[PDB]
Design a protein around this motif. Structure first.
Motif, PDB file in Angstrom:
ATOM      1  N   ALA A 151       0.921  -1.044   0.045  1.00  0.00           N
ATOM      2  CA  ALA A 151      -0.024  -0.100   0.103  1.00  0.00           C
ATOM      3  C   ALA A 151       0.780   1.285  -0.018  1.00  0.00           C
ATOM      4  O   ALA A 151       1.978   1.206   0.331  1.00  0.00           O
ATOM      5  CB  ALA A 151      -0.994   0.012   1.060  1.00  0.00           C
ATOM      6  N   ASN A 152       0.237   2.269  -0.325  1.00  0.00           N
ATOM      7  CA  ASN A 152       1.154   3.564  -0.535  1.00  0.00           C
ATOM      8  C   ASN A 152       1.599   4.251   0.692  1.00  0.00           C
ATOM      9  O   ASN A 152       1.531   3.599   1.764  1.00  0.00           O
ATOM     10  CB  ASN A 152       0.253   4.636  -1.296  1.00  0.00           C
ATOM     11  N   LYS A 153       2.394   5.139   0.630  1.00  0.00           N
ATOM     12  CA  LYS A 153       2.852   5.767   1.936  1.00  0.00           C
ATOM     13  C   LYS A 153       1.877   6.208   3.130  1.00  0.00           C
ATOM     14  O   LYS A 153       2.548   5.951   4.176  1.00  0.00           O
ATOM     15  CB  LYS A 153       3.657   7.324   1.561  1.00  0.00           C
ATOM     16  N   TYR A 154       0.628   6.286   2.778  1.00  0.00           N
ATOM     17  CA  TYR A 154      -0.287   6.207   3.685  1.00  0.00           C
ATOM     18  C   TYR A 154      -1.266   5.041   4.056  1.00  0.00           C
ATOM     19  O   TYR A 154      -2.360   5.120   4.434  1.00  0.00           O
ATOM     20  CB  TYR A 154      -1.136   7.497   3.484  1.00  0.00           C
ATOM     21  N   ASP A 155      -0.784   3.967   3.616  1.00  0.00           N
ATOM     22  CA  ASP A 155      -1.520   2.520   3.991  1.00  0.00           C
ATOM     23  C   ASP A 155      -2.645   2.555   3.010  1.00  0.00           C
ATOM     24  O   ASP A 155      -3.680   1.725   3.295  1.00  0.00           O
ATOM     25  CB  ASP A 155      -1.825   2.422   5.390  1.00  0.00           C
ATOM     26  N   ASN A 156      -2.761   3.258   1.875  1.00  0.00           N
ATOM     27  CA  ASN A 156      -3.836   3.117   0.836  1.00  0.00           C
ATOM     28  C   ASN A 156      -3.789   1.797   0.041  1.00  0.00           C
ATOM     29  O   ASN A 156      -2.652   1.911  -0.569  1.00  0.00           O
ATOM     30  CB  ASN A 156      -3.856   4.332   0.142  1.00  0.00           C
ATOM     31  N   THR A 157      -4.413   0.859  -0.018  1.00  0.00           N
ATOM     32  CA  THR A 157      -4.208  -0.170  -0.382  1.00  0.00           C
ATOM     33  C   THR A 157      -4.915  -0.207  -1.878  1.00  0.00           C
ATOM     34  O   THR A 157      -5.353   0.405  -2.351  1.00  0.00           O
ATOM     35  CB  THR A 157      -4.900  -1.599   0.209  1.00  0.00           C
ATOM     36  N   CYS A 158      -4.269  -1.385  -2.755  1.00  0.00           N
ATOM     37  CA  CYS A 158      -4.749  -1.496  -3.881  1.00  0.00           C
ATOM     38  C   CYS A 158      -6.573  -1.528  -4.029  1.00  0.00           C
ATOM     39  O   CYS A 158      -7.097  -0.990  -4.921  1.00  0.00           O
ATOM     40  CB  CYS A 158      -4.115  -2.702  -4.624  1.00  0.00           C
ATOM     41  N   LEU A 159      -6.864  -2.287  -3.155  1.00  0.00           N
ATOM     42  CA  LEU A 159      -8.425  -2.531  -2.963  1.00  0.00           C
ATOM     43  C   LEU A 159      -9.146  -1.105  -2.629  1.00  0.00           C
ATOM     44  O   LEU A 159     -10.092  -0.866  -3.351  1.00  0.00           O
ATOM     45  CB  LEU A 159      -8.798  -3.405  -1.857  1.00  0.00           C
ATOM     46  N   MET A 160      -8.718  -0.404  -1.882  1.00  0.00           N
ATOM     47  CA  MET A 160      -9.135   0.882  -1.193  1.00  0.00           C
ATOM     48  C   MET A 160      -9.417   1.780  -2.644  1.00  0.00           C
ATOM     49  O   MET A 160     -10.509   2.547  -2.720  1.00  0.00           O
ATOM     50  CB  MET A 160      -8.373   1.593  -0.340  1.00  0.00           C
ATOM     51  N   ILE A 161      -8.280   2.186  -3.249  1.00  0.00           N
ATOM     52  CA  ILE A 161      -8.351   3.202  -4.320  1.00  0.00           C
ATOM     53  C   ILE A 161      -9.237   2.482  -5.609  1.00  0.00           C
ATOM     54  O   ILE A 161      -9.987   3.367  -6.102  1.00  0.00           O
ATOM     55  CB  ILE A 161      -6.934   3.315  -5.097  1.00  0.00           C
ATOM     56  N   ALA A 162      -9.248   1.366  -5.682  1.00  0.00           N
ATOM     57  CA  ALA A 162     -10.175   0.590  -6.812  1.00  0.00           C
ATOM     58  C   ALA A 162     -11.699   0.978  -6.325  1.00  0.00           C
ATOM     59  O   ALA A 162     -12.504   1.062  -7.243  1.00  0.00           O
ATOM     60  CB  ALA A 162      -9.966  -0.943  -6.956  1.00  0.00           C
ATOM     61  N   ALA A 163     -11.809   0.648  -4.817  1.00  0.00           N
ATOM     62  CA  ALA A 163     -13.177   0.990  -4.420  1.00  0.00           C
ATOM     63  C   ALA A 163     -13.652   2.488  -4.437  1.00  0.00           C
ATOM     64  O   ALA A 163     -14.700   3.038  -4.949  1.00  0.00           O
ATOM     65  CB  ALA A 163     -13.332   0.499  -2.852  1.00  0.00           C
ATOM     66  N   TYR A 164     -12.618   3.338  -4.242  1.00  0.00           N
ATOM     67  CA  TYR A 164     -12.515   4.825  -4.315  1.00  0.00           C
ATOM     68  C   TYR A 164     -13.298   5.309  -5.861  1.00  0.00           C
ATOM     69  O   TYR A 164     -13.968   6.151  -5.888  1.00  0.00           O
ATOM     70  CB  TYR A 164     -11.504   5.679  -3.852  1.00  0.00           C
ATOM     71  N   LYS A 165     -12.280   4.908  -6.522  1.00  0.00           N
ATOM     72  CA  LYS A 165     -12.649   5.269  -8.116  1.00  0.00           C
ATOM     73  C   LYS A 165     -13.789   4.495  -8.695  1.00  0.00           C
ATOM     74  O   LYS A 165     -14.047   4.687  -9.735  1.00  0.00           O
ATOM     75  CB  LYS A 165     -11.500   5.094  -8.832  1.00  0.00           C
ATOM     76  N   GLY A 166     -14.301   3.352  -7.989  1.00  0.00           N
ATOM     77  CA  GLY A 166     -15.541   2.812  -8.508  1.00  0.00           C
ATOM     78  C   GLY A 166     -15.287   1.736  -9.563  1.00  0.00           C
ATOM     79  O   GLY A 166     -15.961   1.658 -10.518  1.00  0.00           O
ATOM     80  N   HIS A 167     -14.209   0.990  -9.475  1.00  0.00           N
ATOM     81  CA  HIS A 167     -13.807   0.146 -10.398  1.00  0.00           C
ATOM     82  C   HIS A 167     -14.258  -1.151 -10.195  1.00  0.00           C
ATOM     83  O   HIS A 167     -13.475  -2.074 -10.010  1.00  0.00           O
ATOM     84  CB  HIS A 167     -12.287   0.045 -10.804  1.00  0.00           C
TER      85      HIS A 167
END
Ligand SMILES: CCCSc1nc2[nH]ncc2c(=O)[nH]1
Length: 336
Positions: A151-167
């Motif tokens: 996950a990124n510098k702030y513990d943002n996981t691959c799943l989190m961003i895919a959820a945020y962006k609605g993929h």
């Protein structure tokens, strides 16, 4: 002062003119080749090499050329303008995942390419592809030892961003694979929180199917309570339908949502403000009885006091002005 040729080599790579690159590189000692192909070029606010820029622009033939015929290191890093921002620490592979050039991604990992190599913000090429939702590239990287859990510098996981962006497509893939839905981020948010605040309904159902835990935001807010504030009625009802939230959690969710319907000038609907604020009141008074401690009437919200009894609420069912005020007050109580 031979860096003039390096600028032509860079230009050939950037534009994808593979035969121009070929011509420039022939007739050159090995000393020359490493110089021209490893030249860090500062064109713009950036910094990059011929291999990286070819990758960044999806020039496969140019990329295929430098690898098979000039043994150019793929571990070369750089700094690259993308969607507005300038990302530091990016490799040819990472750039090609962000730009969504599948075939160049294939080329790079086929040769030596660290699928887990991170940018300065600690973004894997997988995260890049997850941000943009190219399911083709996400599938390929994972099948070549890309680590879903970095996950990124702030513990943002691959799943989190895919959820945020609605993929939704990408989200379901990560869940079928290695991905942990219950991971938190530096601010406490989980994949569910993000997919709730943004009202990505399908994704929320997916995360439910995978027994994701309802946990509290850094704000002390369950994903349900985050959907209320974001005025996402569909999502709120969904979470409420699977979950077994204590009457209080339920009441506060219904209120925060209903209240959010009067002020949210984008989804403003004062009649729904009544529907949920009144529904939460009945739940308060079904008895064995959850009474509420209101706040004193300030000039900022007229000088009204927040309805205490159900009878008090029915009194403004048709007074859209007083309901528009009521929403501001309830929310003022719950959050601010
Ligand atoms: C616009 C296409 C993707 S750019 C991008 N930005 C990010 N920020 N934090 C992580 C990442 C990532 O992996 N990629």
């Amino acid at each position: 002062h031979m860096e003039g040729l390096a600028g032509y080599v860079y230009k050939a790579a950037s534009e994808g003119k593979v035969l121009t690159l070929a011509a420039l590189l022939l007739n050159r000692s090995e000393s020359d080749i490493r110089y021209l192909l490893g030249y860090v070029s500062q064109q713009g606010g950036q910094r990059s090499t011929p291999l990286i820029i070819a990758a960044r622009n999806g020039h496969a033939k140019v990329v295929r050329l430098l690898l098979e015929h000039y043994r150019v290191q793929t571990q070369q890093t750089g700094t690259v303008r993308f969607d507005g921002y300038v990302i530091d620490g990016a490799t040819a592979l990472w750039c090609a995942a962000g730009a969504g050039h599948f075939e160049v991604v294939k080329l790079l990992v086929s040769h030596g390419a660290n699928v887990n190599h991170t940018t300065v913000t600690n973004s894997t090429p997988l995260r890049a592809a997850c941000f943009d939702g190219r399911l083709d590239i996400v599938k390929y990287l994972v099948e070549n030892n890309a680590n879903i859990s970095i996950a990124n510098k702030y513990d943002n996981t691959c799943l989190m961003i895919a959820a945020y962006k609605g993929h939704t497509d990408v989200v379901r893939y990560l869940l079928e694979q290695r991905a942990d839905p219950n991971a938190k981020a530096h601010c406490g948010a989980t994949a569910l929180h993000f997919a709730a605040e943004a009202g990505h309904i399908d994704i929320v159902k997916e995360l439910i199917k995978w027994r994701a835990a309802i946990v509290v935001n850094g704000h002390g807010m369950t994903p349900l309570k985050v959907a209320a504030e974001s005025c996402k009625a569909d999502v709120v009802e969904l979470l409420l339908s699977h979950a077994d939230c204590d009457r209080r959690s339920r009441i506060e969710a219904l209120e925060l949502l209903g209240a959010s319907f009067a002020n949210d000038r984008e989804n403003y609907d004062i009649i729904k403000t009544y529907h949920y604020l009144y529904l939460a009141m009945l739940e308060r008074f079904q008895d064995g009885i959850l009474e509420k401690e209101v706040l004193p009437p300030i000039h900022a919200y007229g000088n009204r006091t927040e309805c205490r009894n159900p009878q008090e609420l029915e009194s403004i069912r048709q007074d859209r002005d007083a309901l528009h005020m009521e929403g501001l007050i309830v929310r003022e109580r719950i959050l601010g």
